[PDB]
Design a protein around this nucleic acid. Structure first.
Ligand SMILES: [K+]
Ligand SMILES: [K+]
Ligand SMILES: [K+]
Ligand SMILES: [K+]
Ligand SMILES: [K+]
Ligand SMILES: [K+]
Ligand SMILES: [K+]
Ligand SMILES: [K+]
Ligand SMILES: [K+]
Ligand SMILES: [K+]
Ligand SMILES: [K+]
Ligand SMILES: [K+]
Ligand SMILES: [K+]
Ligand SMILES: [K+]
Ligand SMILES: [K+]
Ligand SMILES: [K+]
Ligand SMILES: [K+]
Ligand SMILES: [K+]
Ligand SMILES: [K+]
Ligand SMILES: [K+]
Ligand SMILES: [K+]
Ligand SMILES: [Mg+2]
Ligand SMILES: [Mg+2]
Ligand SMILES: [Mg+2]
Ligand SMILES: [Mg+2]
Ligand SMILES: [Mg+2]
Ligand SMILES: [Mg+2]
Ligand SMILES: [Mg+2]
Ligand SMILES: [Mg+2]
Ligand SMILES: [Mg+2]
Ligand SMILES: [Mg+2]
Lengths: 91, 101, 66, 99, 129, 249
RNA sequence: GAAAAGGAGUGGCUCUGACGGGGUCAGAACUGGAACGGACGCGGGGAUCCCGACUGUUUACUAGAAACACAGCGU
RNA sequence: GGGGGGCCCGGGGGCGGACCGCGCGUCCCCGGCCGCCCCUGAAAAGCCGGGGGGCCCGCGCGCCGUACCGACCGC
RNA sequence: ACCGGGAAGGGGCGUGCCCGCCCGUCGAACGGGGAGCCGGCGGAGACUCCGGCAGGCGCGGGCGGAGACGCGCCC
């Protein structure tokens, strides 16, 4: 049976710190506890180990990523633009 | 393209209903060295040392080897499993033609 | 300290590696004092007879019972 | 009865190398006996896993035969790491030359 | 298309005391319980450097074993021989033969090297720079 | 008065950085003969957390070019780098995340990080987590390259200054609120003795130019000029304007 | 908010049931100045107004606060 | 998975050194996991392995501390 | 007196060759560290004495396995 109605994982904070902060943490903290997909394993076993550092619990590969998620949207676009610039260098 | 893949899909299903095959790298090596493999099919994230070995073993046996255009999860989906499949080896085409390749 | 099989016991004696032997009555305990370890063998009194006759004359024997 | 004991070491500050256990002596007495730290055994240079066959004893106290494994890279690589080095070496020679 | 584990093929050893050393397939045993095996002869030590300034230096050491084929990596390279003429089961718990069998493979590998034959077989594979 | 807080920090002792258990200084690979005429190959060994730093670091092993053995480097990690990866350094390296190339060989539009402002200095720009520089244009006749710094300023550098392709990993770090005084205590315990902060108006006049008064208040304008002397240069230094307003573009 | 506020039961003895040798939990008869957390240990409660959001810090030896700090916000 | 094996495991047993059972807990150390961090939790002597190349019996172990005490600081 | 790398900075041996970039036998009686247990004796000492049983560091008189794995040195 569902135990809370809105606060979710921020129920650990009680009545403290105000509504705007707890709203931000629910989104941030859900993201950093998530399981992501090994770009190599192809299995859903990547977990954060420190800010910026992500390890597959199956591959055992270690990767550099975002602070609170595996891939950031700026880095996705950068990788996409860099790839097109290389292929254009090919005659 | 679009006509091309709907044949690759059609053949990949034909083998798994009528015709032998195996899923996995260790079953694929033991068959290629014995000359039972009519085809070998790999995923595009197949580990790089393992892929090098499969191609070398293939050229010695003259076993054709292609590359499926999706992750090891797509290959699992394509032949109808819930688990990732790095290598698929077809032993008898049965009702598939295999010309699609 | 360690225990020993009977055949190894005479060879240590046969090479003058023992310093003193003690016979203990309780099954009889034979204790041999080498440079490194004390060795102990347990035999019935029937068996210890022959072993002691084989006893190296250069190897001091003592007895003990109470 | 009263089974309390006094400290065995030079000082009583209970650091990680000053841990004892308790034991009853043949004169009916409760004695203290130091509990040594147990060193790890060697780990693989490529994977960081324990190397098989070596006991967790400092190698000064193990005979030469006890400190080794009987394979190329015996105590350096974990067996799987050797097989992967062998394949990489052989196959790159097959691709840097003759196509 | 075609089987490749045939007598005369050269393999690289992958596990055991002789990992990373070359060998030949004397015989391709049938398949039953326990899997798939082959009688294999190979070099254990190669001779050392010999300056002009030597019988004790330049000898060869051979091994003849039954090996699992999942522990072998074959090659293109090839090596003709006659070693099947005296290697069937005299190498199978027949210890008395098995010692002397190794002795007559030292001689051939010794003979081959002086003629400068099969250079790719008698050269060492470099590992792990 | 007495010496104020900003005057005491220059002397060292309790205000020196907390460098114990740090991995070392992070730099590009030194430019040498082989890199100038070609390219050198390294392999990513680990991805490591450094004390006091937001972005992670990478340990990369290169072969010794003047002897036998290996050489170990410490790089700031671009996002997407992974253990066991092969990187390249030199004039002939290709365009992949992680590679080190002269900025003159990099096409316009590319994201780069850890950029040298003069050749061979081993990298000093866009090093913090999430940052990058852009390559704007090449001027071939003068051998200069134009880049855009993370502040939005523009700058001209040599075309033989080197860069690493990609952007710095750890991005988004500042978007999580510190909730508690305790989370701020743990952050600055790894850097410097700079926290907590006592306000100047909360002090007595002997301690600060803002101190004293029967109400807490500054008393004069808090815009001080550029040529004010040490001990006097508090508040807002040489401000072009003040206040909160929009309309900036 | 909340132990909100408020209620009821609680000993001794003779027994019964449940859990896979072990304590606990549940129930009943009988009995005692109309007693039972029998010593010991152990919140009084509620309706409001002012100040500071909160945990934290301080005038060692007359000031513990509404003062300082703080996350957040801005220049 | 199932069948058969290898290695580690500060521990237990039997023989040496030399009375018999059964239980609930408590403390201490160890194990495999799981959780947490804008915090990621010393260094070196010393000792050992790998790759490549070149090639049983005797004797001894120096220097310094070691009694006692809350007998200490507050005249 | 205070401050400091930019200095032709030392070793192995056996002549004679060869190798070499540049401090500290300062700083912990809780961190690291080769190896100790039982019994007994005295007015006052004991992991130190005596008896017994050990441990550490020194000095002198190429094979087996299918495999995981099992069974002198110098740079
Ligand atoms: K002053
Ligand atoms: K002053
Ligand atoms: K001043
Ligand atoms: K001051
Ligand atoms: K100072
Ligand atoms: K402070
Ligand atoms: K403040
Ligand atoms: K003031
Ligand atoms: K009752
Ligand atoms: K206050
Ligand atoms: K509290
Ligand atoms: K006061
Ligand atoms: K006060
Ligand atoms: K108070
Ligand atoms: K105050
Ligand atoms: K090695
Ligand atoms: K003493
Ligand atoms: K001076
Ligand atoms: K020190
Ligand atoms: K200390
Ligand atoms: K010490
Ligand atoms: Mg004041
Ligand atoms: Mg003033
Ligand atoms: Mg308050
Ligand atoms: Mg308070
Ligand atoms: Mg006071
Ligand atoms: Mg007071
Ligand atoms: Mg004393
Ligand atoms: Mg010292
Ligand atoms: Mg110590
Ligand atoms: Mg005393």
């Amino acid at each position: 049976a569902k135990r809370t109605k809105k606060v979710g994982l921020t129920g650990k904070y009680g009545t403290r710190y105000g509504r705007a902060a707890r709203k931000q943490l629910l989104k941030i903290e859900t993201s950093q506890k998530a399981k992501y997909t090994c770009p190599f394993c192809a299995k859903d076993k990547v977990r954060r180990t420190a800010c910026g550092i992500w390890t597959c619990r199956s591959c055992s590969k270690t990767m550099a990523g975002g602070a609170y998620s595996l891939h950031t949207e700026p880095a996705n676009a950068a990788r996409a633009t860099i790839r097109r610039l290389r292929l254009a260098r090919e005659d | 393209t679009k006509k091309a893949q709907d044949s690759i899909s059609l053949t990949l299903t034909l083998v798994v209903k009528s015709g032998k095959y195996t899923l996995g790298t260790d079953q694929a090596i033991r068959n290629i060295r014995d000359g039972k493999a009519q085809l070998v099919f790999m995923a595009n994230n197949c580990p790089p040392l393992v892929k090098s070995q499969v191609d070398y073993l293939c050229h010695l046996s003259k076993t054709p080897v292609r590359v499926f255009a999706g992750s090891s999860r797509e290959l699992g989906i394509a032949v109808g499993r819930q688990f990732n499949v790095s290598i698929m080896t077809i032993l008898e085409a049965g009702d598939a033609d295999l010309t699609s390749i | 300290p360690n225990t020993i099989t009977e055949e190894n016991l005479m060879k240590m004696i046969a090479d003058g590696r023992g310093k003193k032997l003690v016979v203990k009555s309780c099954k009889v305990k034979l204790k041999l004092r080498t440079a490194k370890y004390l060795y102990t063998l347990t035999v019935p009194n029937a068996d210890d007879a022959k072993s002691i006759v084989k006893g190296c004359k250069d190897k001091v024997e003592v007895q003990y019972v109470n | 009865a009263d089974c309390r004991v006094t400290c065995r070491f030079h000082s009583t500050y209970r650091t990680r190398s000053k841990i004892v256990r308790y034991k009853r002596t043949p004169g009916n007495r409760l004695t203290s006996l130091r509990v040594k730290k147990l060193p790890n055994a060697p780990h693989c240079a490529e994977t960081g896993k324990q190397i098989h066959g070596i006991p967790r004893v400092i190698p000064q106290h193990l005979t030469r035969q006890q400190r080794k494994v009987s394979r190329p890279y015996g105590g350096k690589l974990c067996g799987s790491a050797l097989r992967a080095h062998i394949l990489e070496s052989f196959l790159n020679e097959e691709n840097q030359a003759l196509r | 298309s075609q089987p490749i584990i045939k007598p005369g093929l050269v393999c690289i050893v992958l596990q055991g005391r002789h990992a990373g050393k070359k060998a030949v397939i004397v015989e391709a045993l049938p398949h039953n319980e326990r899997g798939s095996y082959a009688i294999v002869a190979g070099i254990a030590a190669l001779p050392r450097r010999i300056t002009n300034s030597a019988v004790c230096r330049g000898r060869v050491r051979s091994f003849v074993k039954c090996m699992n084929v999942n522990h072998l990596m074959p090659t293109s390279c090839r090596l003709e021989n006659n070693y099947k003429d005296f290697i069937s089961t005299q190498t199978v718990a027949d210890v008395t033969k098995r010692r002397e069998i190794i002795e007559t493979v030292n001689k051939d590998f010794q003979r081959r090297i002086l003629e400068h034959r099969d250079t790719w077989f008698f050269t060492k594979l470099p590992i792990d720079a | 008065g007495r010496r104020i807080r900003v005057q005491r920090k220059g002397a060292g002792s309790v205000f020196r950085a907390h460098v114990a258990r740090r991995l070392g200084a992070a730099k590009l690979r030194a430019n040498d003969f082989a890199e100038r005429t070609g390219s050198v190959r390294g392999v990513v060994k680990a991805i490591l957390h450094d004390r006091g730093r937001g972005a992670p670091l990478a340990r990369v092993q290169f072969p010794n070019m003047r002897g036998e053995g290996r050489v170990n480097e410490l790089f700031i990690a671009p996002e997407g780098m992974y253990t066991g990866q092969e990187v390249f350094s030199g004039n002939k390296a290709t365009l992949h995340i992680g590679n080190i190339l002269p900025v003159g060989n990099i096409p316009e539009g590319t994201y780069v990080c850890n950029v040298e402002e003069k050749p061979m200095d081993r990298g000093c720009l866009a090093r913090a987590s999430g940052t990058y520089c852009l390559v704007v244009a090449h001027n071939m006749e003068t051998n200069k390259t134009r880049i855009r710094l993370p502040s939005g300023q523009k700058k001209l550098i040599s075309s033989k200054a080197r860069a690493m392709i990609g952007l710095v990993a750890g991005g988004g770090r500042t978007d999580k609120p510190l909730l508690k005084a305790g989370n701020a205590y743990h952050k600055y315990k790894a850097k410097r003795n700079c926290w907590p902060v006592v306000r100047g108006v909360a002090m007595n006049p002997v301690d600060h130019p803002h101190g004293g008064g029967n109400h807490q208040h500054i008393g004069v304008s808090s815009c001080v000029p550029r040529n004010a002397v040490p001990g006097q240069k508090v508040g807002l230094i040489a401000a072009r304007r003040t206040g909160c307003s929009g309309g900036k573009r």
